[PDB]
Amino acid sequence: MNKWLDLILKIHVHPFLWIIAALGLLTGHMKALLCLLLIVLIHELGHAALAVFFSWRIKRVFLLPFGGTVEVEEHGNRPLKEEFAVIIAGPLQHIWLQFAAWMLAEVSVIHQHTFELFTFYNLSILFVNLLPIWPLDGGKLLFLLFSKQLPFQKAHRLNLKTSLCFCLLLGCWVLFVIPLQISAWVLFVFLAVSLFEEYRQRHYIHVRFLLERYYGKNRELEKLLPLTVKAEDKVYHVMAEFKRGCKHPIIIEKSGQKLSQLDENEVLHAYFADKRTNSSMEELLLPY
Amino acid sequence: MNKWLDLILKIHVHPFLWIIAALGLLTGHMKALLCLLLIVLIHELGHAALAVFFSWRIKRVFLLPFGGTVEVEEHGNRPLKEEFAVIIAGPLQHIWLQFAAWMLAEVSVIHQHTFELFTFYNLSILFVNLLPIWPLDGGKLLFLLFSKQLPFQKAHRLNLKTSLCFCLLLGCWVLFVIPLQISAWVLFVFLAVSLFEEYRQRHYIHVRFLLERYYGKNRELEKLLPLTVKAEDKVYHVMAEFKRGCKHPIIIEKSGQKLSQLDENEVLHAYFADKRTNSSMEELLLPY
Amino acid sequence: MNKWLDLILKIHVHPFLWIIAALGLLTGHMKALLCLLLIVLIHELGHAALAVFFSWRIKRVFLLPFGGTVEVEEHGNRPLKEEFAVIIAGPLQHIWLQFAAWMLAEVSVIHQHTFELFTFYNLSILFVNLLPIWPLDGGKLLFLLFSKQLPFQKAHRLNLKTSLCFCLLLGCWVLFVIPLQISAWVLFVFLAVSLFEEYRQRHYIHVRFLLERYYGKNRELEKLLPLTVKAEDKVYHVMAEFKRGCKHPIIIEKSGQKLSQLDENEVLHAYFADKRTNSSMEELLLPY
Amino acid sequence: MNKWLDLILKIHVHPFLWIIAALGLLTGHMKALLCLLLIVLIHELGHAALAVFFSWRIKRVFLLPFGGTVEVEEHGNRPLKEEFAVIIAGPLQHIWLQFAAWMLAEVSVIHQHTFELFTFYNLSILFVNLLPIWPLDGGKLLFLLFSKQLPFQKAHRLNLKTSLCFCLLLGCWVLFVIPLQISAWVLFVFLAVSLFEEYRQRHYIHVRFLLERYYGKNRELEKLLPLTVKAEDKVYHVMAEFKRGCKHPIIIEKSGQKLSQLDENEVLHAYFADKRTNSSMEELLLPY
Amino acid sequence: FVVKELVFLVSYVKNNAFPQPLSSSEEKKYLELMAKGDEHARNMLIEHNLRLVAHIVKKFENTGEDAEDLISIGTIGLIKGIESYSAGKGTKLATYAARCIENEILMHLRALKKTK
Amino acid sequence: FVVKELVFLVSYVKNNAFPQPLSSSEEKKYLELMAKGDEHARNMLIEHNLRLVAHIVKKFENTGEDAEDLISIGTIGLIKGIESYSAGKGTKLATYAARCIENEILMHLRALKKTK
Amino acid sequence: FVVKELVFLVSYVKNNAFPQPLSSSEEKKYLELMAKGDEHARNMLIEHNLRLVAHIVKKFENTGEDAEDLISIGTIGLIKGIESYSAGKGTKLATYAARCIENEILMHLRALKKTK
Amino acid sequence: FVVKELVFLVSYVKNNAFPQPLSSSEEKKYLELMAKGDEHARNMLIEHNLRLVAHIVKKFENTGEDAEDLISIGTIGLIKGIESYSAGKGTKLATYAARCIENEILMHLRALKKTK
Ligand SMILES: CCCCCCCCCCC(CCCCCCCCCC)(CO[C@H]1O[C@@H](CO)[C@H](O[C@@H]2O[C@@H](CO)[C@H](O)[C@@H](O)[C@@H]2O)[C@@H](O)[C@@H]1O)CO[C@H]1O[C@@H](CO)[C@H](O[C@@H]2O[C@@H](CO)[C@H](O)[C@@H](O)[C@@H]2O)[C@@H](O)[C@H]1O
Numbered sequence A, B, C, D: 001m002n003k004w005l006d007l008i009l010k011i012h013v014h015p016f017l018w019i020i021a022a023l024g025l026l027t028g029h030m031k032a033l034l035c036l037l038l039i040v041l042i043h044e045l046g047h048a049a050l051a052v053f054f055s056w057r058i059k060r061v062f063l064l065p066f067g068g069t070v071e072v073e074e075h076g077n078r079p080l081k082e083e084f085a086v087i088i089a090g091p092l093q094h095i096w097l098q099f100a101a102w103m104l105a106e107v108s109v110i111h112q113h114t115f116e117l118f119t120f121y122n123l124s125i126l127f128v129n130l131l132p133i134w135p136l137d138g139g140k141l142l143f144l145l146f147s148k149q150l151p152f153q154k155a156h157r158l159n160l161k162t163s164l165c166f167c168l169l170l171g172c173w174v175l176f177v178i179p180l181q182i183s184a185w186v187l188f189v190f191l192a193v194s195l196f197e198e199y200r201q202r203h204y205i206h207v208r209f210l211l212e213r214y215y216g217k218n219r220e221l222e223k224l225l226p227l228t229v230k231a232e233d234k235v236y237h238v239m240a241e242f243k244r245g246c247k248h249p250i251i252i253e254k255s256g257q258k259l260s261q262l263d264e265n266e267v268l269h270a271y272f273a274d275k276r277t278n279s280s281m282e283e284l285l286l287p288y
Numbered sequence E, F, G, H: 001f002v003v004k005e006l007v008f009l010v011s012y013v014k015n016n017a018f019p020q021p022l023s024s025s026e027e028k029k030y031l032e033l034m035a036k037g038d039e040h041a042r043n044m045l046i047e048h049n050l051r052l053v054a055h056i057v058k059k060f061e062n063t064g065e066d067a068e069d070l071i072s073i074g075t076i077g078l079i080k081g082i083e084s085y086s087a088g089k090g091t092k093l094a095t096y097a098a099r100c101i102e103n104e105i106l107m108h109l110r111a112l113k114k115t116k
């Protein structure tokens, strides 16, 4: 994949990482630094490769002073299978690192006391990054299950609540057990900041999802599930009852006895074409 | 007078070296930083001085995080003696550096322990900078030795083969035998990168050499060595069998019989000015 | 809901505080930096919260090298109760801060020596921030006490005189008695600068107060207090004898004889809308 | 002087001075810092005031991390008396600082152990800045005497030579006596850099001097000294024999017997008007 | 046990909310494709200009109205401006889009004020 | 005795006097509500524009007048400008208000000179 | 035994291949000396312009030709362009040389195609 | 003795060689005064443009000639450009002065080459 090579060629680095490397060079902690850099770099390259395969919109691979990120540009507009396969490509890749390390140690290329450090760091990083807090990698795995079981908005809110509860639990645990170990405090602050920034844009996320659902290109068409809704609610309040990766025919109820059956196409056309934002749905049966 | 000041106005410092020095000052590594900086600076000032004296086109005296470099713009241009004098100026300053250090330590200005470290670093750098790997200083001396016995193209191919073999052996040793030694991985990677970049540009050097040869106006004519050619190969194969600093009369062989000698200047004139290329010497024997 | 988050997106940090904290971390002053920062941050968040609740126009929560500041844009505008509630919110958080610190130290999370330093700093800051010097917190309470008894202009002059006298006494003490104490010279200079800047702008406050009074639309009418005036002074001297939160019917004295009461709204209307200034009340008694 | 107040209002400060002040604040060396800042600030304000009095072209008053400077914009184009009075205004001013310190100590405003530190620092700074090295303040006092005794160019060159010799002597003294005390090394490198930068622009300095001498506004017209020159030298070579603050009528010699008497006006007009730069002077008697 | 040293490092994928603004050549290609007729190109053109809607909504604060309806009206204005854009005038697309956003918000605000 | 270990610090509320200038969106809304009827919009418009008079009065300094009358008539001129604004002519409110207040102060100066 | 305390370091001379482009003053002087007669000026002019053919040859890649012939024909075209420069037409030497070299390579390619 | 603590601080006056470039209003005043006739204004105008002489002289290096005569010729060119400047064309003074210096240097170089 040529695009993969182009992505590898233009990896950016934060300035503080150079200072950390210089400090570690003049003290003698270079082996651990190289181990951590290699682990993080491969973990991120797996995500980058599986994102390029599906032809997403990757912008930049980054190396923070406390890890690395891949800055993709897709939020809530892709099928569930792709957003699961891209996420799972990270943790499912430490296995071959472990196997290669074991083989190299057995051949006696590297000493015994080096093989232990690599295994410890590898397993520790995997277990830490498997935690169920947004964004990490457990939160983005629980959110998919929630969205498969619940509509988009309710799943989003429940994810936010559970992530916040777990973040406070982790903070309390850190405070009572180990006030030291700066890395824990940095991780906690990063989690809190990221949670706040994500919570600040729920409406824009929902808007992106709805506009994606409008120009649907019929990606591997799915089943149809009808909705029992009365003709007394707002159209925006019923638009918030759409399930990801499914089709939702509308059943209109008027005074106990249903009137007719409506599809997503005409209501979506009315909302994004007739300038009727939040008027009503009682006249959607006969618009004009 | 003024050329030396102009040279002094050319020194540049890499940004990473500033951070290296700033962190080294605080940690306590000060008795070695001055020694390393002084040794590198003098070793490069020797090259700069004997390059300025012979009227070469200096560009910088850039100082790198892992050593120093001076940049000129003369590849395969100047005669053999100039290049030999410029190159040999490097591994000579160490003698007077050691003599001055011993004199300064005899009158007890520097403690005995300091004297050991300086001479250790001096000898180490002097012996490392003599390895037969391009570019360093051993490789360039070997190239100068080859250029005085073999044609230029063969002398530029065999050097590239030998340096590659030596670099591969060094890389195998430093990766699979010695434990870590972060200061040697940088050397190996830099050597490999420089060798690859030099290999990728093997034709521009030849064309520059030919252009320089054509534009010599009685530039101290020297040893004459006639050469013989056959009717099979074109003029390009004839041009490849040229030696540095020698004029080569060419014998035209008309399938066993020899007509007369062929001047080099007329061959170059037909190749460049008369534009009479893409032809064999049979066409050259019967020009317009 | 959302207003508190909007408030959170208003905090700014002075550049010098970053350097102060960075140097303090390395030297070993870490058990005091957190205490000072936390105390200041809560003491200001109290003001910010009870200013946001009453619908005031916040601008920043700027944090200074020698303390913190919150900036509003309401000078002599809001009623007495609002300003009293906003001001008193400062010297109240210290009670629950001390209670929480004692509770946290009783279950042995923080060592006994740490508890002493925190309560020392808490009481010191609380008692320093109650001095009767403008602006601080004591000066504003004294200003409220003066305003609830005296006309506005006299209450703004007497406060500015008293604060000047107190600041001069403090400056004399700190310069000629106590040895150095660099942390007090900053306080003295800041107090003097703020007092001078506030003295230089004594007319815009009055005109803003008059404009606010004129543009009240039955803004919870309250205690009525009629006033008497004479034929000598103009309308400006009549306007200066107004009290905060009171409506003052005016008696027109025709050299001993009283005609009738004069409404405040008509006086303000003639002053601003009817353009009828630069005249005495005799002209007002006989308008167009 | 309003311009003096304007100069005081816009004093610039180097960023590293803030870091030095922050480091001093967190360690406890504030008294010495304030003493040094006060001494340097007053020493520079004296220069600024005496420069403003004569209506020079001041640009900016600066505070380096190792002292302060005043960046005037006049070089070799002013009468000797002004360039002496401006220079002497610095050292002639520590006297009143010493007297005020003594009086304050006697009144018992400050303790005994503070009065000693101020006197030590004051006298030490004066003695250090009285050294005869360009630029400092002894070099700019010796250069005036040299220019009064010798022509401009010769005085400039002799000043440069003596300053360089004294700089090397000081460097050797520092190396043999106290290798430590970073301040000495900073002063030494600053002196070397300043000497080099000044030596780089001798021709431009001379050009400015000659241009000022052309449009002479007759500033307190002075004596006249004739020059014995033969009509066989270049005009630019005889232009280099002009004494500062004097008039130099020209006596032209042709083969032992002088021809006539020439003034500076006509030769200078020929040089800067007739485009005759470096042809000759034998035809200056009858130009055209 | 070994809790004293863990080094909590992070590795994840960051989902941007608003994609960064797009260049000129391929945006002209997008408009040409839309003129030919394609829904996907229209979708990309719309979703690459949500930053303008974000700024217009945030600077229209200090009014008390909730953000959901304002965001919806801004999106409607943006889609109307993109669909009805005319390249013959000779102005940048972003300015026309922002002006359409402002006009639509003012038009809805007038009706809201009339209603209440 | 306890001194030399105090660290004084400070926390206050810093009531500003001149509100920051309005952005390019609130002025049109305030003008529209004023047209449909809102005195609070007029109050905000005449309060957010008090920065100009501060330099206007100081520019008429060193002439022998107490600042009280100058500032009062400057606010009067600001009311003049706000009340009689016609924004359709294609100009900024700031320059109109500045012209009106300077004309008002010039009228006061002429009247004072005639009376004296 | 002595290793782990070496610090290797390096010092070399790094002969460049393409000289840096001439400034806006030396080209006119070299052209004038060439006009009055100087072959060294021609040598410097043809040496300070190798980057042009360096990118031109790579631009004519993936077509099935060896690099030696392409670089030789590019240098020949560069000599063509530099020899017959007429700077009075109001253009830069770089674009004239690039046009000359690309045209000469096109001539070579057409000749090769006709022969084949 | 007490040599161990001295703190070598510096305090001096810095003489700039080339004064920093001047603004527009007072330079127009300087040209107006020169048109009226004044030597001091001409001196200031000349000495405020020595930076150009510095740059054009330093970029004319790589020729072997000494710097004294080049500096003198640059000053002569600058003074000739200042004296003969015409404001009717409608161009910046600095560009005209630089072009005059370049022309003077080229003319003197051609004369030196012819007389060599
Ligand atoms: C353009 C010029 C550039 C110059 C750069 C700055 C030069 C600064 C030199 C820094 C440097 C080499 C760094 C090379 C990196 C360059 C490669 C660049 C790559 C760029 C990407 C030289 O350090 C030397 O300095 C000497 C002077 O102090 C000292 O040796 C003298 O010997 C006596 C004999 O007489 C003298 O009597 C006496 O005075 C000195 O004892 C030692 O400090 C040391 O030998 C640091 O060395 C490092 O080695 C490693 C062990 O491999 C050490 O690791 C750790 O050691 C234990 C202690 O924690 C730990 O327990 C352990 O966990 C860990 O193993 C480090 O600690 C560190 O020591």
Ligand SMILES: CCCCCCCCCCC(CCCCCCCCCC)(CO[C@H]1O[C@@H](CO)[C@H](O[C@@H]2O[C@@H](CO)[C@H](O)[C@@H](O)[C@@H]2O)[C@@H](O)[C@@H]1O)CO[C@H]1O[C@@H](CO)[C@H](O[C@@H]2O[C@@H](CO)[C@H](O)[C@@H](O)[C@@H]2O)[C@@H](O)[C@H]1O
Binding pocket: A017, A020, A024, A028, A029, A031, A032, A033, A036, A037, A040, A064, A065, A066, A067, A113, A114, A116, A117, A182, A183, A186, E005, E007
């Ligand atoms: C994008 C990549 C990002 C990579 C970041 C840097 C990664 C580099 C890791 C650096 C680091 C972890 C600390 C991380 C904190 C930074 C968190 C980053 C957040 C950024 C905001 C190495 O930690 C490991 O390094 C290994 C090196 O060999 C060693 O393991 C060994 O290997 C094999 C040998 O036999 C064995 O098999 C294995 O059993 C061994 O254990 C051990 O040092 C350790 O395991 C630093 O070590 C830390 O531990 C100790 C000293 O040890 C220090 O305590 C100090 O002690 C006092 C005496 O001085 C000080 O007075 C005091 O101050 C402080 O109490 C710490 O202060 C810190 O120095």
Ligand SMILES: CCCCCCCCCCC(CCCCCCCCCC)(CO[C@H]1O[C@@H](CO)[C@H](O[C@@H]2O[C@@H](CO)[C@H](O)[C@@H](O)[C@@H]2O)[C@@H](O)[C@@H]1O)CO[C@H]1O[C@@H](CO)[C@H](O[C@@H]2O[C@@H](CO)[C@H](O)[C@@H](O)[C@@H]2O)[C@@H](O)[C@H]1O
Binding pocket: C020, C024, C028, C029, C030, C031, C032, C033, C036, C037, C040, C064, C065, C066, C067, C068, C113, C114, C116, C117, C182, C183, C186, D025, D026, D027, D028, D029, F004, F005, F007
């Ligand atoms: C928006 C928030 C801003 C917060 C800023 C950062 C806050 C950092 C605080 C820094 C700071 C005050 C600095 C105030 C400046 C602020 C004014 C701003 C002006 C801006 C322009 C507080 O320092 C306190 O910190 C405490 C915690 O460590 C310690 O006291 C605790 O008490 C126990 C009781 O229980 C605890 O048990 C125990 O744990 C601690 O011992 C001490 O360090 C100290 O009391 C530093 O104090 C300084 O005092 C001066 C003596 O006047 C000292 O001078 C020197 O002392 C000798 C030792 O060298 C020298 O020999 C001598 O030569 C020199 O006299 C300094 O040394 C330094 O100490």
Ligand SMILES: CCCCCCCCCCC(CCCCCCCCCC)(CO[C@H]1O[C@@H](CO)[C@H](O[C@@H]2O[C@@H](CO)[C@H](O)[C@@H](O)[C@@H]2O)[C@@H](O)[C@@H]1O)CO[C@H]1O[C@@H](CO)[C@H](O[C@@H]2O[C@@H](CO)[C@H](O)[C@@H](O)[C@@H]2O)[C@@H](O)[C@H]1O
Binding pocket: D017, D020, D024, D028, D029, D031, D032, D033, D036, D037, D040, D064, D065, D066, D067, D113, D114, D116, D117, D182, D183, D186, H005, H007
């Ligand atoms: C624009 C203004 C610029 C101002 C610049 C800063 C000016 C501030 C001066 C700061 C400074 C001079 C050093 C200057 C070096 C920087 C040069 C600047 C070049 C910039 C590139 C103060 O020096 C004076 O400060 C006075 C404060 O009171 C004290 O005087 C007393 O006052 C009265 C009391 O009774 C009495 O009457 C009087 O008799 C007393 O003497 C003394 O400290 C001293 O006289 C720093 O002190 C220095 O000395 C010693 C510790 O003392 C330190 O040695 C360290 O010791 C080891 C144990 O830790 C360390 O392990 C090691 O590391 C180091 O060996 C030094 O390292 C440094 O700390």
Ligand SMILES: CCCCCCCCCCCCCCCC(=O)OC[C@H](COP(=O)(O)OCCN)OC(=O)CCCCCCCCCCCCCCC
Binding pocket: A031, A034, A035, A038, A097, A100, A101, A104, A109, A110, A111, A114, A118, B175, B176, B177, B178, B179, B180
């Ligand atoms: C694709 C990327 C490679 C992924 C896997 C490679 C790394 C696995 C873990 C090894 C330890 C991490 C090294 C960090 C530095 C360090 O810790 O030490 C570095 C150790 C030091 O050895 P020593 O000082 O302990 O003893 C020294 C006793 N002589 O030298 C190394 O190892 C160098 C790396 C191995 C060299 C080969 C490079 C990779 C070739 C391909 C690998 C095999 C591919 C699969 C084969 C089927």
Ligand SMILES: CCCCCCCCCCCCCCCC(=O)OC[C@H](COP(=O)(O)OCCN)OC(=O)CCCCCCCCCCCCCCC
Binding pocket: C175, C176, C177, C178, C179, C180, D031, D034, D035, D038, D097, D100, D101, D104, D109, D110, D111, D114, D118
């Ligand atoms: C115009 C500028 C003034 C120039 C001269 C003033 C300074 C002279 C030197 C004094 C020491 C330097 C102070 C640095 C800080 C320090 O070192 O300590 C600072 C000392 C601490 O005193 P303490 O802790 O030792 O004892 C404490 C025992 N109570 O308090 C000061 O002094 C403050 C400065 C004096 C206050 C008055 C300000 C100046 C008024 C005018 C001065 C007189 C003018 C002439 C009168 C005829």
